[PDB]
UniProtKB/TrEMBL annotation, chains A, B:
The keyword Cytoplasm does not apply. This is Probable tail spike protein. Transmembrane segments: none annotated. One of its GO terms (biological process) is symbiont entry into host cell via disruption of host cell envelope. Its main location: virion. Coiled coil: none annotated. Keywords: Degradation of host capsule during virus entry, Degradation of host cell envelope components during virus entry, Host-virus interaction, Viral attachment to host adhesion receptor, Viral attachment to host cell, Viral tail protein, Virion, Virus entry into host cell. It is found in: Virion. GO terms for cellular component: outer membrane; virus tail. The chain holds residues 500 to 1017 of 1017 of the full protein.
Length: 518, 518
């Protein structure tokens, strides 16, 4: 019952290490307060091994400035704001349920936990209270966060590193939010991270998950909006968004099954700008909880560190819409590597600008419904990979079937640019057998060798695949001087929903090759 | 005449509430200073109803930190800088004319004004002094501003909520900047807002305007550059940029009439990124003050709250260039809802990526000059709305006439995609009548039923509308095997500036339908 005060340079050489008969850690606090308001703590010094040194309950407008503590904690939720500025934090991080907003600025976290064997009560760095239901009805705003250490002792027992943000309940029959309560059970309403620095390289992935709910109690919602900006993870493995332990979103209370991402409203939003990772993964929830529709925006995302190659790959398993602008893309895979599932809904992908360097593989790996009804669209993209103009390679067929391109360039190795080859043979007047799929809307070029009585000429024709308004084939005519005749060509088409299957190549003269005229 | 000092820990349980014989508020101060420099005020407590408790004149390099005051004010302009950090403010906000820069960081504003009978000296939250001409020759930089309350008394007595930033003069004959003065009469030279939080939902719109000049004195220029980022208005009505009441911009001193927004230089710049609002509106000034040319950039703008649907609408009747990248667009309306005026000049629109979900209406509403000379250009956009492939609907004709699209998809309700239908009939050799407009540069596909002496075939042909270099019609030639003849078709065109009117459908065989091949 204190208000309008300020504390100053208390000095503790090291915190207490209290155990029980079984040599397991028990609670002990250097500072413990209940029912305070308008408090400022400055230059507090209690850092080291042991239990968290701060315990708070039912407080308002708490500020920590220039402190050196191993934990900032709050059992009963706070209200108003909670500010941690210019503070160095220990392995426990921050554990606080709240009905307000949390602010972090210029905070360093040290994750070493060697003295403790396992004993990690909350699996993330910034956590809600697992004994209060795991709710935080407010936003979290982070600026210039620095991470050092690894927390190897926890990883040995659990098998994975710590998460960045965690919000879950230990037991839904003891800690939960009742239906009649006016509290909205948000894990965190919003998460904004602007500036994450990791000066030391990590072999593997930096975090187990960005937002984690590793329980099976299903008490709180996944955050409505997550934004990452200027975050350098400095790791050699892809980061992932795990969505497998969250309550059903309040945007779909009736639990309507979504068939296409464009036929339902979005329920969650993710933005990543100017951040550096090797890859990003989205894992959908299990059945009876899979009713979300995500909206993802990626801008200028690639790997800048020298040890792990530049291009990044996008793994996805959750229904949603994906937009990429000026990114260093490597591959698009419609599966989650963590679980192995292969997607069960129709998504949307759009790529604008940047470079699509697939290295030694195909640009896309999409197999849900054989890839039909998946509109991958690219505009003004430079494609680098195992493409060829004289041989029909796997990359040539993959990019022609799955990607609708416009104003794009292709370059395998040489200083110049090439046109991918799709088919080679002799398309005479009786037809020739072909078998390959092309996305409707792509432009194809055909090299024609026209021969008259005693004269011949090389013809370069251009053909556009119809969008699918009709069941007719793709055909056209052109003229050639020095032979004084018309050249007629036609490609047979079989319906493949968004794509088309070429089954027969036919021309009045001989067609020698079909090229991707992107 | 004080300098190089600091003041700490002054507690005032509540500010003075001074009135006059007519029970109206009069001035009263807790702190008052003239001619100071290098001053720091920390932990000042004076909060509640009454007149603003701070009044300053002619100062340099003033700093407020960790304060709890109902107003921060400067009557005569300051120079150097003015900083408000980690401070809680009352309903008055900040009122300061300046000859320097203003900085705000982590400031909470409470808008409740019940005790006052609806009287506000200024109509915004951050204001320039109206008794000094309403000028501020310098920038305004805001970071993590939080708004609580509603200011219901002022809204009840005026009809609209308070504005965000305000700069105007009460009387131009008493407070103004003379021509011979070296002061440049900027309202605010630059406005940068990064982070706006509104934890409580508002029924209506949060602010009357972003930058407001609600007088008819015309003493200061509109801000040259305005930037918004990570702003969540949490309201159910659109926000608007009101451009009435501003002095003519110095970029057009001779007041040259602009006609196309591309033949004159830009005069004002607006950027909005990752903001959440229902809509956005631009209202042009009245005649004798409409000489501005705006440059607007919108990146990733949509509504994320659960109560108001995701897609956002753009209202504008002001001459300028508009760019949208990855936005959740609903409709583009070339009129102002506030005033009802439509337009008088030619603008430019460019849409890249994102989703264009028009719900149950048309994607565009453009009227000025019947839509001609307005180049709306889209690239890689997914269109959702009342489209149909078996029937001709208004959305089909609207999107065909007003939007020039390339690499775009259409989905009405189903799990698959459709091609909008523009015309149905029987286009024989004589020619069937038709009447519909299509923007030049779009690709049109037509379903043709070809019949030979005994054989028949379905033909799918594509056509590109010429850009307008000539007065000839759009024609083409294709070939069909199994009928052994060429198929010729032609669409009669009537020139409408950037568009073309199709008046006749002609083909040697029968044309049964015309589709938008995008």
């Amino acid at each position: 019952y204190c208000a309008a005060f300020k504390a100053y340079d208390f000095f503790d050489p090291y915190p207490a290490f209290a155990v029980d008969s079984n040599n397991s850690l028990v609670y002990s606090y250097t500072l413990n307060f209940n029912d305070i308001a308008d408090a400022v703590f400055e230059n507090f010094n209690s850092q080291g091994y042991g239990w968290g040194v701060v315990g708070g309950q039912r407080s308002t407008n708490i500020t920590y400035r220039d402190c050196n503590l191993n934990r900032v904690d709050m059992h009963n939720p706070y209200m108003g704001y909670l500010k941690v500025l210019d503070t160095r934090l220990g392995t426990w991080g921050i554990n606080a349920s709240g009905m307000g907003d949390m602010y972090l600025e210029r905070v360093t976290v040290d994750l070493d936990d060697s003295a403790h064997g396992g004993h990690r009560e909350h699996e993330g760095i910034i956590n809600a209270r697992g004994d209060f239901g795991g709710f935080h009805d407010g936003g979290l705003y982070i600026k210039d966060l620095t991470i050092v250490g690894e927390a190897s002792a926890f990883e040995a027992t659990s098998g994975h590193p710590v998460a960045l943000v965690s919000a879950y309940s230990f037991n839904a029959s003891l800690a939960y939010i009742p239906e009649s309560s006016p509290v909205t059970p948000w894990g965190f309403k919003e998460v904004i991270v602007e500036g994450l620095h990791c000066p030391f390289k990590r072999t593997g992935r930096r975090f187990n998950s960005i937002i984690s709910a590793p329980s099976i109690q299903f008490t709180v919602y996944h955050p409505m909006r997550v934004k990452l900006e200027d975050c350098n993870f400095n790791s050699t493995a892809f980061e992932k968004f795990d969505l497998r332990g969250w309550r059903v979103t309040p945007y779909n209370p009736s639990k309507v099954g979504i068939a296409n991402t464009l036929a339902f409203r979005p329920t969650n939003f993710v933005d990543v700008k100017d951040c550096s990772m090797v890859g990003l993964e989205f894992t959908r929830p299990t059945s009876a909880y899979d009713y979300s529709n995500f909206d993802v925006n990626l801008v200028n995302v690639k790997n800048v560190e020298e040890h792990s190659l530049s291009p990044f790959t996008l793994y996805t398993n959750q229904c949603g819409r994906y937009n990429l602008v000026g990114c260093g893309l490597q591959q698009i895979v419609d599966k989650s590597m963590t679980s192995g599932e292969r997607a069960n809904r129709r998504s949307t992908f759009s790529v604008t600008g940047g470079t699509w360097n697939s290295l030694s593989g195909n640009p896309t790996d999409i197999t849900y419904g054989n890839g039909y009804d998946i509109p991958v669209v690219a505009t003004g993209v430079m494609f680098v990979g195992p493409y060829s103009q004289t041989e029909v390679t796997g990359a040539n067929l993959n990019v022609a079937e799955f990607v609708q391109a416009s104003g794009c360039k292709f370059l395998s190795s040489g200083p110049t640019y090439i046109q991918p080859l799709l088919w080679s043979g002799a398309g005479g007047p009786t037809g020739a057998s072909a078998n390959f799929n092309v996305a409707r809307g792509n432009t194809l070029g055909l090299n024609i060798s026209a021969v008259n009585g005693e004269t011949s000429q090389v013809i370069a024709a251009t053909l556009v695949i119809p969008q699918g308004f009709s069941t007719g084939p793709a055909a056209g005519t052109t003229y050639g001087f020095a032979v004084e005749k018309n050249i007629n060509y036609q490609l047979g088409l079989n319906a493949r929903s968004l794509k088309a299957n070429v089954g027969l190549v036919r021309c009045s003269d001989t067609i020698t090759g079909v090229y991707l005229n992107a």
